[PDB]
Amino acid sequence: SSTVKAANWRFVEVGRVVLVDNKELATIVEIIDQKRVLIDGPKIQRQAIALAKIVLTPIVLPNLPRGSRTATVTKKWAAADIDAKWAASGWAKKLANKERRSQLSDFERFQVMVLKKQRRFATKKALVKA
Amino acid sequence: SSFEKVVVIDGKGHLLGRLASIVSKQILNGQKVVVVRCEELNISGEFFRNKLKYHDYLRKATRYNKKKGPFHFRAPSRILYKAIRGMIPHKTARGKAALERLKVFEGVPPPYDKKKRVVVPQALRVLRLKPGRKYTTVGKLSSAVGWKYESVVEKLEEKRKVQSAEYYAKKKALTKKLNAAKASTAESEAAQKLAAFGY
Amino acid sequence: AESHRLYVKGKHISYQRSKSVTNPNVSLIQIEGVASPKDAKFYLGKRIAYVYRAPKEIRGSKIRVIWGKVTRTHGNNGLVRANFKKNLPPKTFGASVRIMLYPSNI
Amino acid sequence: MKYIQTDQILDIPEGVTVDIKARVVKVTGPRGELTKDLKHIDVTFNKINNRAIKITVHNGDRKHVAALRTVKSLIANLITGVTKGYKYKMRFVYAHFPINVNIIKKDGQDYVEIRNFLGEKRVREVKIHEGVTMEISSTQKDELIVSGNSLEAVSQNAADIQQICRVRNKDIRKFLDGIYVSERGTIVEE
Amino acid sequence: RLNEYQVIGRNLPTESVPEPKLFRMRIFAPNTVVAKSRYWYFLQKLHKVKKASGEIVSVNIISEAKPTKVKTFGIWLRYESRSGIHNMYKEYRDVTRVGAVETMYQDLAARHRARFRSIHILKVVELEKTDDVKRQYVKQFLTKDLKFPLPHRVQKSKKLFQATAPTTFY
Amino acid sequence: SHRKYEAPRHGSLGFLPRKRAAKQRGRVKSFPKDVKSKPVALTAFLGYKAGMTTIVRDLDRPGSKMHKREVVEAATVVDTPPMVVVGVVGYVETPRGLRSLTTVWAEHLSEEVRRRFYKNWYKSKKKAFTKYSGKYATDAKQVETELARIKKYASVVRVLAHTQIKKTPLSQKKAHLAEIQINGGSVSDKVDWAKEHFEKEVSVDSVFEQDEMIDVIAVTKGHGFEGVTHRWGTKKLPRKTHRGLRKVACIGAWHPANVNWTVARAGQNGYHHRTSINHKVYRVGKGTDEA
RNA sequence: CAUCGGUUUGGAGCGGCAGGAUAAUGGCGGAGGAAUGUGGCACGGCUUCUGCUGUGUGUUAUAGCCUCUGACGAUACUGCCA
RNA sequence: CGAUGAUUUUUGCCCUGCACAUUUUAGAUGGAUACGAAUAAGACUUUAGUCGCUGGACCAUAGCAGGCUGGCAACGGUGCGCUUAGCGGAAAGGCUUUGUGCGCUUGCCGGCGGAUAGCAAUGUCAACAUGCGCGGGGAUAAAUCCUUUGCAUACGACUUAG
Ligand SMILES: NC[C@@H]1O[C@H](O[C@H]2[C@@H](O)[C@H](O[C@@H]3[C@@H](O)[C@H](N)C[C@H](N)[C@H]3O[C@H]3O[C@H](CO)[C@@H](O)[C@H](O)[C@H]3N)O[C@@H]2CO)[C@H](N)[C@@H](O)[C@@H]1O
Ligand SMILES: [Mg+2]
Ligand SMILES: [Mg+2]
Ligand SMILES: [Mg+2]
Ligand SMILES: [Mg+2]
Ligand SMILES: [Mg+2]
Ligand SMILES: [Mg+2]
Ligand SMILES: [Mg+2]
Ligand SMILES: [Mg+2]
Ligand SMILES: [Mg+2]
Ligand SMILES: [Mg+2]
Ligand SMILES: [Mg+2]
Ligand SMILES: [Mg+2]
Ligand SMILES: [Mg+2]
Ligand SMILES: [Mg+2]
Ligand SMILES: [Mg+2]
Ligand SMILES: [Mg+2]
Ligand SMILES: [Mg+2]
Ligand SMILES: [Mg+2]
Ligand SMILES: [Mg+2]
Ligand SMILES: [Mg+2]
Ligand SMILES: [Mg+2]
Ligand SMILES: [Mg+2]
Ligand SMILES: [Mg+2]
Ligand SMILES: [Mg+2]
Ligand SMILES: [Mg+2]
Ligand SMILES: [Mg+2]
Ligand SMILES: [Mg+2]
Ligand SMILES: [Mg+2]
Ligand SMILES: [Mg+2]
Ligand SMILES: [Mg+2]
Ligand SMILES: [Mg+2]
Numbered sequence A: 001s002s003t004v005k006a007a008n009w010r011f012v013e014v015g016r017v018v019l020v021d022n023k024e025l026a027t028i029v030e031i032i033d034q035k036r037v038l039i040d041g042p043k044i045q046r047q048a049i050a051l052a053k054i055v056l057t058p059i060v061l062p063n064l065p066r067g068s069r070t071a072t073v074t075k076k077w078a079a080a081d082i083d084a085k086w087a088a089s090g091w092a093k094k095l096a097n098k099e100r101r102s103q104l105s106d107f108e109r110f111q112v113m114v115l116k117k118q119r120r121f122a123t124k125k126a127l128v129k130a
Numbered sequence B: 001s002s003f004e005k006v007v008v009i010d011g012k013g014h015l016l017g018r019l020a021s022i023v024s025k026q027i028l029n030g031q032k033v034v035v036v037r038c039e040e041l042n043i044s045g046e047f048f049r050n051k052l053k054y055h056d057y058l059r060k061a062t063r064y065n066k067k068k069g070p071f072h073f074r075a076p077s078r079i080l081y082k083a084i085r086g087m088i089p090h091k092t093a094r095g096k097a098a099l100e101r102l103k104v105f106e107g108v109p110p111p112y113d114k115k116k117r118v119v120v121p122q123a124l125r126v127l128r129l130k131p132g133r134k135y136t137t138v139g140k141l142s143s144a145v146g147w148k149y150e151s152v153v154e155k156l157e158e159k160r161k162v163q164s165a166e167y168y169a170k171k172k173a174l175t176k177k178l179n180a181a182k183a184s185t186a187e188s189e190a191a192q193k194l195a196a197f198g199y
Numbered sequence C: 001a002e003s004h005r006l007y008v009k010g011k012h013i014s015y016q017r018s019k020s021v022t023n024p025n026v027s028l029i030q031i032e033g034v035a036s037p038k039d040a041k042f043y044l045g046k047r048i049a050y051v052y053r054a055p056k057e058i059r060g061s062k063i064r065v066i067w068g069k070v071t072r073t074h075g076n077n078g079l080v081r082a083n084f085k086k087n088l089p090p091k092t093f094g095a096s097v098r099i100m101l102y103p104s105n106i
Numbered sequence D: 001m002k003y004i005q006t007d008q009i010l011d012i013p014e015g016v017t018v019d020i021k022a023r024v025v026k027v028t029g030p031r032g033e034l035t036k037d038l039k040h041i042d043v044t045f046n047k048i049n050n051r052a053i054k055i056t057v058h059n060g061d062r063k064h065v066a067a068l069r070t071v072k073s074l075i076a077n078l079i080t081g082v083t084k085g086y087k088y089k090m091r092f093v094y095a096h097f098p099i100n101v102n103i104i105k106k107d108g109q110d111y112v113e114i115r116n117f118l119g120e121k122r123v124r125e126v127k128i129h130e131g132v133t134m135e136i137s138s139t140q141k142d143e144l145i146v147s148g149n150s151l152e153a154v155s156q157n158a159a160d161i162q163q164i165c166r167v168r169n170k171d172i173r174k175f176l177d178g179i180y181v182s183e184r185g186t187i188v189e190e
Numbered sequence E: 001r002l003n004e005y006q007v008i009g010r011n012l013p014t015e016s017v018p019e020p021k022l023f024r025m026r027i028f029a030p031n032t033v034v035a036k037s038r039y040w041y042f043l044q045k046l047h048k049v050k051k052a053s054g055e056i057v058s059v060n061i062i063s064e065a066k067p068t069k070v071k072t073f074g075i076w077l078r079y080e081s082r083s084g085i086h087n088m089y090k091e092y093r094d095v096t097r098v099g100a101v102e103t104m105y106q107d108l109a110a111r112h113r114a115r116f117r118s119i120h121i122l123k124v125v126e127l128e129k130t131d132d133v134k135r136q137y138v139k140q141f142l143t144k145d146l147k148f149p150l151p152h153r154v155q156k157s158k159k160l161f162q163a164t165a166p167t168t169f170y
Numbered sequence F: 001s002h003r004k005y006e007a008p009r010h011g012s013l014g015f016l017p018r019k020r021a022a023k024q025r026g027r028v029k030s031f032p033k034d035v036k037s038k039p040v041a042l043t044a045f046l047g048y049k050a051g052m053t054t055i056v057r058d059l060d061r062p063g064s065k066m067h068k069r070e071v072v073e074a075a076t077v078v079d080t081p082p083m084v085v086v087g088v089v090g091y092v093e094t095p096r097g098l099r100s101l102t103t104v105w106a107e108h109l110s111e112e113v114r115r116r117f118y119k120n121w122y123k124s125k126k127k128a129f130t131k132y133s134g135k136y137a138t139d140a141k142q143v144e145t146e147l148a149r150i151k152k153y154a155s156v157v158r159v160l161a162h163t164q165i166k167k168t169p170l171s172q173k174k175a176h177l178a179e180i181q182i183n184g185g186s187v188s189d190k191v192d193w194a195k196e197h198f199e200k201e202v203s204v205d206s207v208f209e210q211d212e213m214i215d216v217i218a219v220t221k222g223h224g225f226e227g228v229t230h231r232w233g234t235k236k237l238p239r240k241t242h243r244g245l246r247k248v249a250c251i252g253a254w255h256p257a258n259v260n261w262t263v264a265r266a267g268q269n270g271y272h273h274r275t276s277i278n279h280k281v282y283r284v285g286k287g288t289d290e291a
Numbered sequence G: 001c002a003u004c005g006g007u008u009u010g011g012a013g014c015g016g017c018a019g020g021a022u023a024a025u026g027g028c029g030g031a032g033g034a035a036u037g038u039g040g041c042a043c044g045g046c047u048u049c050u051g052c053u054g055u056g057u058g059u060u061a062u063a064g065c066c067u068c069u070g071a072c073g074a075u076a077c078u079g080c081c082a
Numbered sequence H: 001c002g003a004u005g006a007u008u009u010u011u012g013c014c015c016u017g018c019a020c021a022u023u024u025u026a027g028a029u030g031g032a033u034a035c036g037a038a039u040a041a042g043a044c045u046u047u048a049g050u051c052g053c054u055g056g057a058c059c060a061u062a063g064c065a066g067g068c069u070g071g072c073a074a075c076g077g078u079g080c081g082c083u084u085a086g087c088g089g090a091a092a093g094g095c096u097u098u099g100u101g102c103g104c105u106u107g108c109c110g111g112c113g114g115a116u117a118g119c120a121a122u123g124u125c126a127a128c129a130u131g132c133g134c135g136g137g138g139a140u141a142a143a144u145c146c147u148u149u150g151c152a153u154a155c156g157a158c159u160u161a162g
């Protein structure tokens, strides 16, 4: 055999899902340059953006033709169910938990501390015998 | 952005002047800084150019008495110190106090061999230079200009890394055991409540 | 309670100044954890105390305080301008100040 | 111009197993193994199959594209070094003074000992690189055979032998004496 | 930051000539004050008219027809160097006709040190056919199934110090 | 304008400053580089300059006009009674240079070496090294612990030895104590050799053989304050020069408006530390030999 | 501390109105066209056709795109809000 | 800058435990939270899954600046004091560890206390240094002037001897 280690990059291709502004999802519909792409999405405005302003996700929207219009992008996004695919990843889960933590109140933080005390007691009890 | 009692920076892979300016402004603002592994610092530009630059620096000396002139320090830590001091009003009492807030070393001597070293992304060579550019390691320039203890430092750094590797293997084993204990106490009332809170 | 702090950590950085002339009547303060004028705008109007130690006792206490207040933001990285009852002495450059949470508007 | 993508295709013969991980190429063949580190170049590798490897440069400028086919050629030279070997033949050129060449061993090291070069009392010694074999040709008078798997070491040892026999303070157009590389081929004839 | 303007003007009517011909120009200007200034600059380069003897008739913004359709534009230029006057032709990929001109102005500033005052835009044409594309540096983006990664990603940090090793995966 | 003629400089800039040595005992700045494969042996010895003499020797130098022919040569006699080993020092390789880790001493020190640590011996209670001598109490485990530390951590091992100056005709009673680097063998071998040689005499015949080439470290003859003419070998000024002639006429150009460090000036001459190399050993004599 | 008055710096500020190609887009409907030709089909190299793939063909099929257009509905930008 | 010898029969010196009072502080106010290496690559958990896309993390965090008492569940956690063993010389002066004793435990539940500092005023709580009282262990010097020397020297200084 050969056993060549290949790069696991994310590629700039028609159908790549990207995060914009740490809030919204979008997909690449056509490549402008090494630096610029045309993006579209159900909850975003179809626009030409610089690749520095977006982050490629490991997700590809399969079978998206180059230059697809807003209707095609929305229809294929609904078919591929990109929102559910995103929401199941540890990245989106970490973002959601960060938001949830940011919405806690002082009383909820106090309760968090109390629950941490109880769980640490249980964890030490489990750890000493295992 | 937090204020730390001491910030210990691992100097490996850092560009000399960007780290120097950042550390100067940090110590001027009352922050204590320790820089370790100054022999692993980086300067942009090929090695020969920096050797020529250091020889231009060496050219400069007080004519009537060489003992009064610039003192060309050959150690990597002293090169970083010169870079920083050029960025400080060192002839005032305030600059003197700011410089007292700073320490620079070759290698990682005690007690810092068992403490946390951080990096400075705004000054990292691997993140700043274009991927084709050539760079210099300050340890090789120092040996090339008179620093005598390169092989002593590399012998002691290999010894430190052997001990530091044993540390990590112990920490990974105890981290694995605690995770198995945290897995047992999962799906408990505290864990379910902590999951609704985001923890 | 291992912690008892009721103030935000700050640092006395500088006076308001040009290249060569300094203005002691305005101090530049770095609030800990603040990195933008939007974050720093939460702290506008909050009173500031500089707490220091002195040789002579006053009413049995050797601790004296100079009080101030936040007036405006400064620049783009979350520094603020402060106005103290008595100007902060220049030797306090790099010394820590206390950013009080009052007058509170939460 | 920042060419968007440039590719080269390595071809791996049947008995050869290239092996690449983090720009460290280890080529294995019937004749042995050779290794080379490429951390000074920005290239990426894709295994098309067991007989072909794609070597790619993405968004590379003129010089960075130029550094791609040299990577291809170096790995190909490794492959033919581990499947056919390398052989350089040197001819001894002298007008009057015979060149006395011996293969000696001092201090546990192999050396090529050149004596009487242009009548000099000086004894020239060239260290023989590891993995390089020297032989005094029997079928040919005044011939040295330098052989080995690595083309770089063999050609550099040959160059060492050639460089140590330079003529000083004379018209080198007339005084053509020296030891020169006459043939650059392979151990296995083709 | 530019806009495309339609500026129409004419000579002031005389009793000899009461309806002078109306001339339109397409001007890429940041605002209408520079748009009407550039108009008179080129008419006095072509026609016997002045701002004192003329009249601006209309200024209207020309919006992109399909601002979210990726196009390739060919721009014909006439620029002044330190030594002479030269004609050049270049090609740009962008979604707006204006955005190709903004790249063009940045581009001739960077490779030829040509300032805005030294440049005349003769023509901007959208290349409908892929055979209309003459330049390689934009033709290389018209290949089928174009994919490429972005190796060596550098992440901008909000904090001065980071407690974990830097990475460039992407 | 330039000098009318180009002459070489007066004196060497590699022996500045021409000041007095900090100590009268010359100190070995650098020792021979250590080779593990050699046997454990000393690299230095201390002696006293007795005087000069003359020898006659048949020369063995092919191609010389004096080959196999008698030559008359000046020679120097160095009185070298055996030295006594009293201590050992360990040195550790550090990123700041060699650093002394520990010094271990012998149980008994002779009076001549205990006088080394005193300026007024006759007025003293002579308390030096008495508690340390007590450190050897019935098990001497403190000494063994320090020696094990030296074996474990030291990279350079040097012995401490003193001359037996009471065997010389000098009226001085203070011995001269110096560190002599130990070369050969492992660190453990050096430490065992040093410990086993405590309170023992070591002779010159165990350090130097005949026909060897050795170096000499010493402080030269003092001459006190000297003028430039003899201190630096400068040209005497003409006989008819006002205010004297044993001077340097021009001590600098107008600019730099300072006196340069390279100009010859009057000052203290001699009593300098010098290292002189490649002196051949014609004879290692023995005091017990009647010939 | 509260409230006021004068001056002033702001907010991820909120709302109403007007203008423009009575924005241009986009979405929906209809008509036409091409290729960086989708499905299909025909030859191949590796696949027990395991996003197989290359090339040819051709015009919506098991993707789509471009142009024109018909009736609505928005938004950007900019002004004004006593 | 290091190693090492000796350190005032003085009410003087060293080490140490407590206790107190002072001067100083370039500026405590939960925690300086320890692999290495690469980056056209990496981690983890077994070449395949997961991870990153920042520390908005992790640990710690409840109790008159944290009081007085009582009870369960567990046999854990932690502070301090002896104590066991091992490792660390790059500036180790720290990192572990055995047994034991005295506390606390907020893992959970009870009973009692805080007011008046009056609507804020740092509303005083830390470590470095020095001195002083006790208690305990411990040791009991030199250098200079002077005379002398001449390996030295203008005088200081230097090599000697007393
Ligand atoms: N699943 C829908 C698919 O639509 C595709 O076909 C699409 C195109 O061929 C067709 O072309 C354009 C379209 O791009 C554009 N966005 C709208 C325009 N009205 C369409 O035009 C065409 O389709 C419409 C019906 O939609 C017809 O009324 C009209 O006559 C025809 N020229 O619009 C169709 C629908 O968007 C597939 N080729 C077809 O096999 C399939 O039905
Ligand atoms: Mg620790
Ligand atoms: Mg030097
Ligand atoms: Mg204080
Ligand atoms: Mg010549
Ligand atoms: Mg000639
Ligand atoms: Mg690192
Ligand atoms: Mg002259
Ligand atoms: Mg030396
Ligand atoms: Mg010690
Ligand atoms: Mg010690
Ligand atoms: Mg004299
Ligand atoms: Mg004399
Ligand atoms: Mg004289
Ligand atoms: Mg005269
Ligand atoms: Mg006079
Ligand atoms: Mg008002
Ligand atoms: Mg007001
Ligand atoms: Mg409107
Ligand atoms: Mg429309
Ligand atoms: Mg068409
Ligand atoms: Mg097809
Ligand atoms: Mg409309
Ligand atoms: Mg409308
Ligand atoms: Mg508006
Ligand atoms: Mg208004
Ligand atoms: Mg006090
Ligand atoms: Mg990593
Ligand atoms: Mg994991
Ligand atoms: Mg693994
Ligand atoms: Mg594995
Ligand atoms: Mg994997």
Ligand SMILES: [Mg+2]
Residues within 6 Å of the ligand: H057, H058
């Ligand atoms: Mg963490």
Ligand SMILES: [Mg+2]
Residues within 6 Å of the ligand: H033, H058, H059
């Ligand atoms: Mg932790």
Ligand SMILES: [Mg+2]
Residues within 6 Å of the ligand: none
């Ligand atoms: Mg209790």
Ligand SMILES: [Mg+2]
Residues within 6 Å of the ligand: none
């Ligand atoms: Mg218990």
Ligand SMILES: [Mg+2]
Residues within 6 Å of the ligand: none
């Ligand atoms: Mg100590």
Ligand SMILES: [Mg+2]
Residues within 6 Å of the ligand: none
């Ligand atoms: Mg110590």
Ligand SMILES: [Mg+2]
Residues within 6 Å of the ligand: none
């Ligand atoms: Mg600890």
Ligand SMILES: [Mg+2]
Residues within 6 Å of the ligand: H120, H121
């Ligand atoms: Mg107050």
Ligand SMILES: [Mg+2]
Residues within 6 Å of the ligand: H125
């Ligand atoms: Mg108190």
Ligand SMILES: [Mg+2]
Residues within 6 Å of the ligand: H125
């Ligand atoms: Mg208290």
Ligand SMILES: [Mg+2]
Residues within 6 Å of the ligand: none
């Ligand atoms: Mg004297």
